Amino acid sequence: STGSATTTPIDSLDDAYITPVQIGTPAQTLNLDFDTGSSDLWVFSSETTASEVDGQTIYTPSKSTTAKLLSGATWSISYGDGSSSSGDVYTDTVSVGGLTVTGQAVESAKKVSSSFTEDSTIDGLLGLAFSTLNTVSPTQQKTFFDNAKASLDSPVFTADLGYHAPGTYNFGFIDTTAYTGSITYTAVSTKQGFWEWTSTGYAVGSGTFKSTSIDGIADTGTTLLYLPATVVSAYWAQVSGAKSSSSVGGYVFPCSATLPSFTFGVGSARIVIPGDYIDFGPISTGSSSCFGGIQSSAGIGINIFGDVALKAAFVVFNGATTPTLGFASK
């Protein structure tokens, strides 16, 4: 089997992407944030504290003839940005882009933190990291991809995120029309539960490539590109007036600037992030100070190849017995 679904930016800055997901019988369609940096599929639901729902579409298990309470199971997750959610668990039928899993753990939120409430466009998350990170207790549950794997024509999914435009998540096949040149594959460590790999270096604008190993994770659920302070300093040093602001919480730059591109290495290959991809607009409405899309990972504890990086590429998440990552230009 295969699946293919369109993923759409939630706003004009590509702060995140939502992908329609059919849950239950008859289908309830929710728009979920596909997240390769976590491993829970959770949704706003009829069980979510009423004051914490504001415009989201909810999953109502009682209206699904295929929903079954997973007795005793609870979940609780906190994300790198400080947001969190928690609740109980149903199994139900979940379909993505024509691809159907029966018995998928659907994690029903009883509580969500303010940032989820405040985002009416995201109805939940669909985790695509490794199942070892799944927070369901006392019986850990498998991701959607893990459950679908055996049925897929090929044990892979691909992320093709758009810049200010829709893109695609495909399951079970590689669309050879969706990229240019070849796909370069690189090794993955699953030891932390992430799609963790090692970039072979970087360049700033038309500058020469610096060969240096940068361990990080391919994370569709993170907006920006988080890299070592040395790298990030080298990038922003090429932008007149750019500075790190503790009051704003990272690098900002004059909105009048033209940003340089940023290149990262995948083995011997190179992925170029256009400078426009690194502009995340005024820090506040009407401000002439703009927020940078490349930020320091110092104090995160890990480098994150988030949407800023991934949307410049066609990315293959290969879940074969020995997982790997593939990157192509597009």
UniProtKB/Swiss-Prot annotation:
Alphabetized UniProt keyword annotations: Aspartyl protease, Disulfide bond, Hydrolase, Protease, Signal, Zymogen
Catalysed reactions, semicolon-separated: Hydrolysis of proteins with specificity similar to that of pepsin A, prefers hydrophobic residues at P1 and P1', but does not cleave 14-Ala-|-Leu-15 in the B chain of insulin or Z-Glu-Tyr. Clots milk
A GO BP entry: proteolysis
Disulfide bonds: C255-C290
Enzyme Commission number: 3.4.23.22
Domain Peptidase A1: 17-328
Catalytic machinery residues: D35, S199
Gene Ontology molecular function, alphabetical: aspartic-type endopeptidase activity
Family (UniProt): Belongs to the peptidase A1 family.
Protein name: Endothiapepsin
Source species: Cryphonectria parasitica (Chestnut blight fungus)
Residues of the full protein shown: 90 to 419 of 419
